[PDB]
């Protein structure tokens, strides 16, 4: 889809290796039923999660459709981690292997724009589960985005980043079909800007439960935070787990 062509060169500046990353690694590790049964990440990106997670669970298999994102992770793998890169599309990727933990996080599933494509990805993810394995999906929570828009099709916001002179401006657009378009502009301390855009589908725990039931899975308790906080409509992300 070109998300890596939009972001791969600066993705780690947008979503850096900070405490939010550490919280996700800790939560996924706690949610792993059995590291000896293996781990696969759908949408591995630059390895922001897979690299540190592999330091606890061992080798992680990481699937991504973007050559640019995989190339960025390969650079990082020369220094850290134990990850097998797999170039593949999570709507189509099929294997004879099965895994104790299958995870798809940081709104990867919302980059699939139609219910049909999301349903297909959940079917493929379910087929990768070992018996007793767990599927973990994390994506952006929908109600807070609608609240942010407050009845307007377009809205703009700016998030200052820790380093002086840095931050990200987002131009947000709501579109028909529960679509959410963003253009993000990173402002760097050296005075340069980087622009990238993405189109996502606003997705809910209700919808993911239906995808998972169609794939033969049953839901576990929905979460608003990796620490086990139950789902609410205010948190920026949510986590759904299936067995």
Ligand X SMILES: Nc1ncnc2c1ncn2[C@@H]1O[C@H](CSCC[C@H](N)C(=O)O)[C@@H](O)[C@H]1O
Footprint of ligand X on this chain (CB under 6 A)?
1, 3-4, 15, 43-45, 48-49, 64-66, 69, 89-91, 105-106, 108, 111-112
Give 152 or 195: the residue with its C-beta nearer to ligand X. Answer: 195
Q: How far is the CB of 64 from ligand X (least distance, A)?
A: 5
Q: How far is the CB of 144 from ligand X (least distance, A)?
A: 19
Give 7 or 242: the residue with its C-beta nearer to ligand X. Answer: 7
Give 112 or 125: the residue with its C-beta nearer to ligand X. Answer: 112
Give 118 or 172: the residue with its C-beta nearer to ligand X. Answer: 118
Alpha-carbon distance of 144 to 166, in angstroms, equals 25
Q: How far is the CB of 129 from ligand X (least distance, A)?
A: 18
Task: Return the exposure string of 56-67: e unless at least 16 CB atoms fall within 10 Å of the residue's CB, then b.
Answer: ebeebbbbbbbe
Chain centre distance of CA 228: 18
Q: How far is the CB of 131 from ligand X (least distance, A)?
A: 25
Alpha-carbon distance of 116 to 55, in angstroms, equals 35
Q: How far is the CB of 4 from ligand X (least distance, A)?
A: 5
Give 74 or 191: the residue with its C-beta nearer to ligand X. Answer: 74
Give 64 or 207: the residue with its C-beta nearer to ligand X. Answer: 64
For residue 105, count other CB atoms closer than 10 A to its CB: 24
- Output the DSSP codes for 148-206: HHTT-SEEEEEEE-SSTT-EEEEEEEEETTTEEEEEEEEEPTTS-EEEEEEEEE---HH
Helix axes 50-57, 19-31, angle to 10 degrees: 40
* Residue number, nearest CB to ligand X: 45
Report whether 72 contacts 103 (CB < 8 A). no
Read off the DSSP letter of residue 187: E
Q: 3-class SS at 93?
A: coil
- Alpha carbons within 13 A on the beta-carbon side of 44: 32
Q: How far is the CB of 241 from ligand X (least distance, A)?
A: 16
């Amino acid at each position: 889809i070109g998300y890596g062509r939009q972001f791969a060169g600066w993705y780690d500046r947008l979503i850096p290796d900070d405490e939010v990353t550490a919280e996700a690694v800790k939560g996924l590790l706690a949610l792993h039923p059995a590291p000896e049964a293996g781990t696969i990440e759908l949408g591995v990106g630059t390895g922001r999660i897979a690299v540190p997670l592999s330091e606890s669970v061992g080798r992680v298999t990481g699937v991504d459709s973007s050559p640019e994102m995989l190339d960025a992770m390969r650079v990082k793998l020369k220094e850290r981690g134990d990850v097998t890169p797999v170039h593949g599309d999570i709507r189509s990727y099929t294997s004879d292997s099965r895994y104790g933990l299958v995870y798809c996080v940081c709104a990867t599933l919302s980059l699939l724009h139609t219910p049909e494509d999301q349903q297909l990805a959940v079917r493929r993810a379910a087929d990768l589960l070992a018996p007793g394995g767990r599927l973990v999906i994390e994506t952006h929570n929908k109600p807070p985005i609608l609240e942010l828009h407050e009845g307007r099709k377009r809205t703009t916001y700016f998030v200052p980043y820790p380093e002086p002179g840095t931050g990200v401006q987002t131009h947000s657009t709501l579109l028909d079909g529960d679509l959410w378009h963003c253009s993000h502009i990173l402002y760097q301390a050296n005075g340069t800007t980087r622009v990238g855009s993405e189109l996502t589908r606003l997705t809910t725990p209700e919808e993911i439960d239906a995808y998972a039931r169609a794939a033969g899975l049953e839901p576990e308790t929905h979460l608003s935070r990796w620490d086990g906080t139950p789902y609410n409509e205010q948190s920026p992300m949510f986590v759904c787990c299936y067995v």
